[PDB]
Design a binder for this molecule. Structure first.
Ligand SMILES: *[C@@H]1O[C@H](CO)[C@@H](O[C@@H]2O[C@H](CO)[C@@H](O)[C@H](O)[C@H]2NC(C)=O)[C@H](O)[C@H]1NC(C)=O
Lengths: 46, 48
């Protein structure tokens, strides 16, 4: 039990992966609010 | 409207420091979140 504590204190990639995936998707969602898709601008006030 | 920047939100006194040629600041994901008042030249945050 004393070695678990060292090996961790010094491995949680499966938990890091699901956090990263969700953040990478939420950022791609917002970064799409600045594409034209074939229009004159990306702003409705323009 | 700050000399062209049109928006909506609450304005608040800031504590960031632009460089003395930068007008407004942006966030990651690219949304305006700070401005500089042209007349008095002070930085103000923009919260929704
Ligand atoms: C724009 O003009 C205003 C006045 O029309 C200037 O305001 C002055 O600011 C100084 C601060 O250094 C005060 O001592 C004066 O009393 C202010 N004048 C008035 C009428 O309030 C303002 O400074 C100008 N903009 C810039 C960038 O200088």
């Amino acid at each position: 039990i004393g070695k678990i504590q060292d090996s961790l204190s010094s491995a949680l990639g499966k938990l890091q992966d699901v956090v990263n995936h969700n953040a990478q998707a939420l950022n791609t969602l917002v970064k799409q609010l600045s594409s034209k898709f074939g229009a004159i601008s990306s702003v409705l006030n323009d | 409207n700050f000399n062209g920047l049109t928006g909506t939100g609450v304005l608040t006194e800031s504590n960031k420091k632009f460089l003395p040629f930068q007008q407004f600041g942006r966030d990651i994901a690219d949304t305006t979140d700070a401005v500089r008042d042209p007349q008095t030249l002070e930085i103000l945050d923009i919260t929704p």
